[PDB]
Structures are given as C-alpha cells and as structure tokens.
Amino acid sequence: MRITIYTRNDCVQCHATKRAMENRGFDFEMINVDRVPEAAEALRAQGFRQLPVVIAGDLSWSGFRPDMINRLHPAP
Structure with missing residues (x-):
C-alpha cells in the first residue's frame, strides 16, 4: 500500500x-506541493x-x- 505525504517546508504538522x-x-513518498503545483491544484480540488x-x-x-497515521499499520 502506497502512502504519499503532500508537504511544504517550514510546516510543523508536516514534519510531525x-x-x-x-x-x-x-x-512513504513525499511530494512538495510548492515544487509541484499540479499536486497543490489537485488537492485544492478535493477540498x-x-x-x-x-x-x-x-x-x-x-x-x-x-490517530489516522495509526490506521496505516500493516495487516498480518
């Protein structure tokens, strides 16, 4: 299962x-939304x-x- 974190520098919640x-x-993979505006736009369209x-x-x-991160623990 792929986990992608859309992030920004100087973002405390992102680092946490x-x-x-x-x-x-x-x-997980990280995608900086400032370096990749296509992702920023896509995320905004999803609300x-x-x-x-x-x-x-x-x-x-x-x-x-x-609490949501804990839902990512692997299944047996």
Whole structure:
C-alpha cells in the first residue's frame, strides 16, 4: 500500500507526520506541493485546506493526525 505525504517546508504538522511515520517503520513518498503545483491544484480540488495531506489507499486526511497515521499499520 502506497502512502504519499503532500508537504511544504517550514510546516510543523508536516514534519510531525513524517517523524510519526518513521517512528512506526512505514514507507512513504513525499511530494512538495510548492515544487509541484499540479499536486497543490489537485488537492485544492478535493477540498483540502491545510497541510500535510496524506493519501493512503482509501484514506485521505489533512493536518497532523496521529490517530489516522495509526490506521496505516500493516495487516498480518
């Protein structure tokens, strides 16, 4: 399952999210929305209003959400 974190530099909630995923041994890709406006536009069209935005399988959320990150633990 691919986990993508849409991020921005100087974004505390983004850093917290990355660190939280690393603390749990998750593999993820990061996409800087300032360097990739196509992604920024796509996220705005889906209604997101804050960063980071995490997309993983059927889940998609914004902001630092430890509770949602915990839903990414691998199945047996």
